[PDB]
Amino acid sequence: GALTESQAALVKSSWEEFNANIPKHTHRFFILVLEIAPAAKDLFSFLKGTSEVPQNNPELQAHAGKVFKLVYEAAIQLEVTGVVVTDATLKNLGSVHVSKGVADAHFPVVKEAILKTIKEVVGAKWSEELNSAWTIAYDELAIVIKKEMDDAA
Ligand code: HEM
Ligand SMILES: O=Nc1ccccc1
């Protein structure tokens, strides 16, 4: 696919749809995660000592929102420039993941959780062309953070 002017136009459009409902899309995202892997729960300070995923936890929202924003930015950056650029932030991200005890095999958990989350977000406008575009953008961004973890470990 590569990321045509037409494919990028498709990710932008679909991210705008995600941000449009943070407390929902972020809580959905945590549940998809715990469905794909339950053990993940002990990781999160704000999930530990709980029984269910808190729904109005500021910490949870702020944090999951940041995740999706980062994947979208990555897709534009691919169409324009042809690449995903590693900055200060991506590097600090890599540190904190390691402290919290997160590994690589965790990443397809959060990917499927995100493709499924975006399929649920765009509904009928879904195309092969679009799936192809988010997949390209996640893959390309995971490649970068995993890189920074390994570096923090
Ligand atoms: C490209 C994919 C990913 C992106 C863009 C991403 C992004 C982030 C960001 C931005 C934060 C810090 C939020 C804050 O300090 O304000 C964070 C924290 C965290 N992330 Fe990720 N992440 C990704 C994949 C993963 C994976 C695969 C896991 C493992 C299940 C994970 C587990 C965690 C945990 C445990 C924290 C600490 C939360 C705390 O205890 O309060 N992340 N991530
Ligand atoms: O996947 N990374 C996450 C970031 C912040 C909170 C929870 C998860």
Q: How far is the CA of 140 from the centre of ligand 2 (A)?
A: 18
- CB of 106 closer than 6 A to ligand 1? yes
- CB of 27 closer than 6 A to ligand 1? no
Question: Could you give the CA distance from residue 39 to residue 31 in angstroms, rounded to a whole number?
Answer: 12
Question: Could you give the CA distance from residue 130 to residue 119 in angstroms, rounded to a whole number?
Answer: 9
Question: Could you give the CA distance from residue 114 to residue 118 in angstroms, rounded to a whole number?
Answer: 6
Residues in the chain: 153
Work out the widest C-alpha separation in the chain, in whole angstroms.
47
C-alpha count within 13 angstroms, C-beta hemisphere, residue 124: 0
Q: How far is the CA of 11 from the centre of ligand 2 (A)?
A: 21
Residue 45's nearest CA partner among 117, 99, 94, 106 is 99
**Domain housing 148:** 1-153
Name the residue with tokens 């029984």: 51
Residue 47's nearest CA partner among 22, 66, 32, 30 is 30
DSSP H helices, the chain, are: 5-19, 22-36, 58-81, 88-99, 107-122, 128-152
**Number of folded domains that form the chain:** 1
Angle between helices 5-19 and 107-122 (to 10 degrees): 90
Q: How far is the CA of 128 from the centre of ligand 2 (A)?
A: 27
CATH assignment of the domain containing 90: 1.10.490.10
CB contact burial 66-94 (16+ within 10 A = b; e otherwise): ebbebbbbbbbbbbeeeebeeeeebbebb
Name the residue with tokens 């269910």: 52
Q: What Å resolution does this PDB entry report?
A: 2.0
Which amino acid, one-letter code, is at 40?
A: A
Question: Could you give the CA distance from residue 51 to residue 96 in angstroms, rounded to a whole number?
Answer: 24
